From a paper:
Neuraminidase (NA) is a receptor-destroying enzyme that cleaves SA, facilitating the release of viral particles from infected cells. Three mAbs—FNI9, FNI17 and FNI19—stood out for their binding to a broad panel of cell-surface-displayed seasonal and animal circulating IAV and IBV NAs. Collectively, we identified broadly neutralizing NA-targeting mAbs with unprecedented breadth to seasonal and zoonotic IAVs and IBVs, which can synergize with anti-HA stem-directed mAbs. Owing to the functional constraints associated with the SA receptor interactions, the key contact residues of the FNI mAbs are highly conserved across IAV and IBV NAs.
Since the 2014/2015 Northern Hemisphere influenza season, a new N-linked glycosylation site at position 245 was introduced on the N2 NA as a result of the S245N and S247T substitutions. To dissect the effect of the N245 glycan on antibody activity, we produced a panel of three N2 antigens derived from H3N2 strains isolated before and after 2015 together with their counterparts in which the glycosylation site was either introduced or removed. We next investigated the structural basis for the reduced binding affinities to N2 antigens bearing the N245 glycan. Two-dimensional classification of the cryo-electron microscopy data showed the presence of N2 tetramers carrying the N245 glycan saturated with three or four FNI9 Fabs (6.08% with three FNI9 Fabs and 91.20% with four FNI9 Fabs) or FNI19 Fabs (6.05% with three FNI19 Fabs and 93.27% with four FNI19 Fabs), whereas only zero or one FNI17 Fabs (77.03% with zero FNI17 Fabs and 22.97% with one FNI17 Fab) were found to occupy each tetramer. These data are consistent with the lower binding affinity and neutralizing activity of FNI17 than FNI9 and FNI19 versus the N2 antigens and viruses bearing the N245 glycan. The energy required for the induced fit of loop 242/252 could underlie the differences in affinity and neutralizing activity of the FNI mAbs against the recent N2 NAs.
Numbering used by the authors:
A (entry chain C): 2 to 130
B (entry chain G), D (entry chain E), E (entry chain F), F (entry chain H): 82 to 469
C (entry chain B): 2 to 110
The structure:
């Protein structure tokens, strides 16, 4: 399974951005698709993920409200929407497939680590045009 | 038969005496026993019953493999008299991967949740027939107590949550009369996240001590008014906190209104009850995993969040042996309402890799005004020896 | 949970043993992956549990540790192996924090 | 106890909520469970019961070989409370390779057919004793509903057929009082072939939706007058037809009086009921084999033969999983008569050659006036892994 | 609850309809089923019960070896509702290698014989407690009916014999009230050897058709007066005789007073009942071994010893399949007393050497005034395939 | 329901007739049967029940190894109707490695002891709920009767001991009303060591024949006044002594007040009852080990310590077969109170090394005023052949 992402983006503060991810093979499995970003010259940061079959997604508190993960079996795509952008949100956004494929009410997530990553999507943000 | 009203005073409790043990995993090594998790105990006016969510399989069975998952189409609510293990003559009372049951004094209510994670159905089964149903309101695993509901004057209350269990967005209290949903109250007060409530009659109301999976290692309280359907919520004040994970007793702290933010994420189903300003509570002996089980009273621990003065400690399961969920159930006596609890004794996957299955036994203890000694009553199965 | 990673940069000669450290703020049990990132690319999984190599990962990459301290040892760095490395815990409950990363960089005259 | 009269109105139905599942093939892989087929559900005034025709064998047993055969001297009617699987403590209530059962409000009636194909006996067992019997009238497999009979004011009606499987046959309606046959009406009206009726009280009468094994992929209706024993018959009007095999929804059509002559030959036991001019019905999702199961309402589908306007579709079993027979049963509620159905989930021979046996699980759904979500509740056994 | 009086007239009988079959040898091949012999049926006012003498072992068990022995300390009377097979939850009601049971309308009486051949004890157990006992009077295997006793107005009668298997023996009729032996009558009249009586209420008296193990292939009759304890005895007149062994129908003969002296030695437990001057009777189809089973009416066969005019023959078990003991039991209906019978279907040793064990199934038929067809309902187990 | 008062005279007893046998070790070789020891029988007003202490395992199970150990956290009190063997559907009524049970005429009382040897808890469970508890007073294995308690006018008495096995111990008599301990009397009189009392109603009081584990091979008597709670104690006078070990009948002697100091140390649970000046008693046939079992009457053996005049001997278990504990239970008849007893038939470790487990069967005999014969009714299992 390769993963493929939408092209690079450039945005004003206060706007909204759409990034998308597709597999090379058949339409999406039960393995969690997740969104991780790398801020420029700085560490990785998980921001959320979706079980593509059941369509339930969860998010880091840092992104809660302003991010949404959406899955569609027909376009075979997971979409990550981010809103009210600013200089802080200028970063590379990675699509990634977890070994994890189920959420247990009681016990949480097993094997939530990333086996496959997309090529990354740069999102650029400045007040300047 | 009349409806239950539970209007007797709470019994004097000096601690808890042994009441029941099923030895289910030990029996499963030489006989056809159901794979289960999320047990609980509830009593009709005469007899106590053990409940559990089956995995649609016996333990010595090819279908017992991969029984870690909490939601499947094959999960059913098993019901037996307490002490009869879950053998093949056990009644599956409904399709359920989450449930609550109670007897109103005339008949059983079962609240049975099954179907898709995004689009679950709760069925309300009363006196043997489906009376009502409700769909998932926030489309993210509709779930309920995994322990007994409580009925006063024929109105049963059950706490149900959907979503990530956030307060008013997600948690509702349903008022149910002969299986019909008559009212639905949104969670109000300062409890931020409320799951797997352990509820008890506290006439005229119902009191629930619950799980916070996000912010508290202190436990949420929900107080339910049965007459006017009003809801209030807060946290168990006690500086000795009841959730797992939690901080150790020397470094833990608590708040009467708010989650303590100490090891707040994740949790276990557990219980507590007030005894004036004191609290009786059970918890795992280990702070970071479901190992051992202990009960104690914390002096002023219902009212004072700085209190760490415990007395009347009992080991139920010693610290080297697995526990699991625990919950309260209430038993009407001659002149008072007694409080009892059960401990789920989880065995197998993922923590034990000698076997392919996950299952539980139970041990059950009841409040005593008399005297009691010491012991440990763990599961007792040898997973090295028995069916993989 | 906070993941602390050291050193922030490690200098190593070609054909020499590297050792990298990750520390958690709590017990993450054995739930700790190591990723390798070359700067032009997305990360590659090397280690899961805290010791099993992922598919196709060369045997010279070796992981160990449990509870709260973990290490990745690379037996003899080829030109292939000079990269940034990240630990991440996969404890059963969110969020899934990463270490700030260790750069592994070449030593020369 | 009084006789049942069913004189309450039919409940408001928005669809069906999950009620029961037996998991009996999954339990068979580690347990002594009866080999069965042709299950059904019927309730006394307190409890529901599951019925099935045993094959005189458990599944993990040398006698489970060749249990694809539908008529043998060893077949018996098994009876349990609903949700208790068919374990070795199950009561065989009579010798039967075809049956119907119902409770009149005082006692159980079982109609039990066994013996030679060309010379079968129906025994009528009421309140635990044989009260009556009748021989095969056409000498070509006397057979009955394979689902509940219906009793009003102590008169129970059962539909019985003798004669050709794919050709003209002799159908009679027997009126039975405390197990004694008091009247026998010949089938009248325009239904040309009537097998395996699914009957429901529709006070003052009984209404049956049946199988046409010869000419219709539309389903016959038999209307039974309880007072004057008169019979009327016709077909379910809806252009969305309930039988298997059938034409696809775009090319299917129907007639109110006649069989449609579209994939008319062969059939499956199924059900439908009226809701004013609308019809609620279940069917297999596949048009050519017993795969999947769905329910829906067809708007004007009881009165208008051109109508294909469905709403309120529910998947019960997804289209990749085996179904089987299905039938209605009626449950008396506080103020209304609810409609419920069961689906037989057939596993093994002829279609699955992993195993030598043929057997079934059950899943049971009840009408709800409330709300509900989605799911699929198939059999769930892995025939690759379990006893051959 | 009142005492039974059986004072209704005997039902019109055209023949017998199928009522029950246990399939217990087929179930034994994949299930924990008791090894049994000498079954019988008896009913309380609500339900019928199957009884058998256990061998203190299940069939798939090392202790099932050598179960051809009829008297051991491990034999117990098993009691279930009719149609529930003898699984491990079966109640052993008493220690017994010979028994009789009946319900007087208030409670069960069990007559249970065990101990040494030369010094056996009969225990009388009534309403769950031992009320009386008697020792072996002739010191040579005290034995009783191996079928139901009969109670009228709270007095139960049982026939017991002690003494020679193939010679003169001492037969007594015991009159038992709430388990207390109130009277004991010696056998009077012309019956010369009386074993294993099949008794029926024939108000005001009890009539018994028995086994002559010495002189008759015609069957003894014992007539028991319940009021004055007087006894009369004779033989079933019909030239078609009921015992095995016997002469073929073309050469057999009978006497109304005497044993016929045709193949007189040895026998099988069987039954007959009067229908005016006609007799209804069952017998093995084979004259020399217990193969097949048939019932028929003999015209004038109760009054005329030259009569061989049979009508209304039914095969119960076809002539290639094993039968065994058979006995009558009586069922009270709405307006009349019905006659029913059971056939023991013996499998294994001595006659079948594929296996080490001896055990039985049962098939049960009840009198019908209605119509009926044909069939054969044998045991159905494949002893080549199942546990040795 | 009313309370039992047992105010009928004791029945005339000529000896004992066979009543019940479980065959549970023979059934264990092909069936899921509980490992047990320390059985007893007790009856509600309708039915008798068998009780035993389970070992939290079935016999054909890995957990049946090392079941010679008498105190473990997994031991539970099993309860069935008498004659239903301990199969997997058996109710565990409480956690217990020592117990007593009785029915007061309204409900069951179970006295259930578990926990640490040095700090055990007795739980009092009445009408299905924990009513009371008491800790070990001497911190050295709190222990009770291992047989039925006795209730008169709603007050139940149980004898409990704490302290040395072979030395001075503290014995108390607890008076229990609807599960509440209302009074506690210390043992008064001349009995120097009192274990495992076998108690019977002897209206107005309760009489107990017990085990002296220190000084007597004669058995202690405890006489319990129900009204004023006063206690008297002494020894069974008969020169034929009831304990094991003991001296042979020619050399044994006894004292009415004191332990005899003949093979005084160790013992077995057994029973005796007065019949005027005579005593009926059971004992092992072997003087040194638990082999065989016999009952007899000793003439003047309740009043005269020099008397060795026995009559009415019965072998229950022949001297080559294992016995075990035995105890009395009382059954109310129409006009009198009958005495019955059970014998535990211990099989396996320590004495039999063919197997790894220790378990028991039961045989039960009831007093008869009638006549009886001879026999032996041992366990009957072949430990060479069955699961190790
Ligand atoms: C969670 O669980 C719940 C409960 O289980 C799920 O909801 C249920 O979803 C199913 C989906 O299958 C629904 O059944 C389906 O109903 C439609 C008909 O209903 C739609 O069309 C109605 C007619 O519309 C016209 O006319 C009205 C005026 O009357 C106009 O206003 C319109 O503009 C149109 O001109 C319309 O009235 C309906 O609206 C109502 O319901 C919706 C919610 O769905 C509300 O928003 C509205 O306010 C209003 O209350 C509705 O829009 C049928 O078409 C379906 O059958 C077709 O599709 C099947 C597969 O889905 C297929 O198998 C059938 O063969 C059939 O297909 C045929 O017909 C089609 C056209 O008619 C063709 O396209 C096709 O090729 C083929 O020829 C089906 O019966 C349930 O009603 C619904 N239940 C409830 C109680 O809501 C929910 O989905 C679950 N959620 C998740 C996320 O899982
Ligand atoms: C659970 O989900 C809810 C709903 O999205 C989260 O609450 C939202 O949080 C953001 C950021 O604080 C706000 O903009 C929204 O208004 C909140 N919605 C509501 C209804 O409160 C919540 O933070 C999540 N919590 C966890 C721990 O997952
Ligand atoms: C099943 O079909 C056959 C025809 O193959 C029926 O035979 C009928 O027999 C009677 C008496 O000889 C004739 O009068 C009819 O004309 C025959 N029917 C036809 C269509 O030829 C047979 O009776 C049918 N079974 C039933 C019960 O109707
Ligand atoms: C529904 O039924 C019709 C009739 O069987 C199908 O129509 C046929 O389509 C095939 C090609 O797919 C042609 O060979 C036939 O000539 C068509 N027949 C008619 C009468 O039109 C139709 O394909 C079916 N639809 C589906 C989705 O299966
Ligand atoms: C059973 O038959 C035997 C054999 O004839 C009977 O025993 C004989 O009894 C007579 C009369 O007491 C004696 O004279 C003989 O010596 C006995 N013979 C033997 C071989 O013992 C016996 O009495 C018969 N049993 C009964 C109950 O009638
Ligand atoms: C059991 O036996 C022991 C040992 O003889 C008793 O213990 C003694 O008790 C007396 C009185 O308190 C002391 O003077 C001794 O010093 C004790 N010795 C030991 C070894 O502890 C014990 O009291 C006896 N009683 C019971 C109830 O078990
Ligand atoms: Ca088995
Ligand atoms: Ca928490
Ligand atoms: Ca058809
Ligand atoms: Ca003869
Ligand atoms: Ca002694």
């Amino acid at each position: 399974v390769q993963l493929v992402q939408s092209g690079a983006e450039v945005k004003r503060p206060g706007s909204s951005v759409k990034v998308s991810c597709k597999p090379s093979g058949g339409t999406f499995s039960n393995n969690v698709i997740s969104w991780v970003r790398q801020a420029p010259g700085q560490g990785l940061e998980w921001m959320g993920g979706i079980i593509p079959t059941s369509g339930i997604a969860n998010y880091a508190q840092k992104f809660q409200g302003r991010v949404a993960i959406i899955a569609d079996k027909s376009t075979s795509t997971v979409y990550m929407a981010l809103s009210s952008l600013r200089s802080e949100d200028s970063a590379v956004y990675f699509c990634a497939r977890a070994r994890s494929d189920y959420f247990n009410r009681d016990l949480g997530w097993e094997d939530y680590y990333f086996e496959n990553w997309g090529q990354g999507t740069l999102v650029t943000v400045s007040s300047a045009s | 038969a009349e409806y239950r009203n539970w209007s007797k005073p709470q019994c004097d409790i000096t601690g808890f005496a042994p009441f029941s043990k099923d030895n289910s995993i030990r029996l499963s090594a030489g006989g056809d026993i159901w794979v289960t998790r999320e047990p609980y105990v509830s009593c009709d006016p005469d007899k106590c019953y053990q409940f559990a969510l089956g995995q649609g399989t016996t333990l010595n069975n090819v279908h017992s493999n991969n029984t870690v998952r909490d939601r499947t189409p094959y999960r059913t609510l098993l019901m037996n008299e307490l002490g009869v293990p879950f053998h093949l003559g056990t009644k599956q009372v409904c399709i359920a991967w989450s449930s609550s049951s109670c007897h109103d004094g005339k008949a059983w209510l079962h609240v049975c949740i099954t179907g898709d994670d995004k689009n679950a159905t709760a069925s309300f089964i009363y006196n043997g027939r489906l009376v009502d149903s409700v769909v998932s309101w926030s489309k993210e695993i509709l779930r309920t107590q995994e322990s007994e509901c409580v009925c006063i004057n024929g109105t049963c209350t059950v706490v149900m949550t959907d979503g990530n269990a956030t307060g008013k967005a997600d948690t509702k209290i349903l008022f149910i009369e002969e299986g019909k949903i008559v009212h639905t109250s949104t969670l109000s007060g300062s409890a931020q996240h409320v799951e797997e409530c352990s509820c008890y009659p506290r006439y005229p109301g119902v009191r629930c001590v619950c799980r916070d999976n996000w912010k508290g290692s202190n436990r949420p309280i929900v107080d339910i008014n049965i007459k006017d359907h009003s809801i209030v919520s807060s946290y168990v004040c006690s500086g000795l906190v009841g959730d797992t994970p939690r901080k150790n007793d020397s470094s833990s702290s608590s708040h009467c209104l708010d989650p303590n933010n100490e090891e707040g994420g994740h949790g276990v189903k557990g219980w507590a009850f007030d005894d004036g300003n004191d609290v009786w509570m059970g918890r795992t002996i280990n702070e970071t995993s479901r190992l051992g089980y202990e009960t104690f009273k914390v002096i002023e621990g219902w009212s004072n969040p700085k209190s760490k003065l415990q007395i009347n400690r009992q080991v139920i399961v010693d610290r080297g042996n697995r526990s699991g969920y625990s919950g309260i159930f209430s038993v009407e006596g001659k002149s008072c309402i007694n409080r009892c609890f059960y401990v789920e004794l989880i065995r197998g996957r993922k923590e034990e890799t000698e076997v392919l299955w996950t299952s539980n036994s139970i041990v059950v203890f009841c409040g005593t005004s008399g005297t009691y000694g010491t012991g440990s009553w763990p599961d007792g199965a040898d997973l090295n020896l028995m069916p993989i | 949970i906070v993941m602390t990673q050291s050193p922030a940069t490690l200098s190593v000669s070609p054909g020499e043993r590297a050792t990298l450290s990750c520390r958690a703020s709590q017990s993450v049990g054995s739930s700790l992956v190591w990723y390798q990132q070359k700067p032009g690319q997305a990360p590659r999984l090397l280690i899961y549990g805290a010791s099993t190599r992922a598919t196709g990962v060369p045997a010279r990459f070796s992981g160990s540790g449990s509870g709260t301290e973990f290490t990745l040892t690379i037996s003899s760095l080829q030109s292939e192996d000079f990269a940034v490395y990240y630990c991440q815990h996969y404890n059963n409950w969110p969020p899934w924090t990463f270490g700030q990363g260790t750069k592994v960089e070449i030593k020369r005259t």
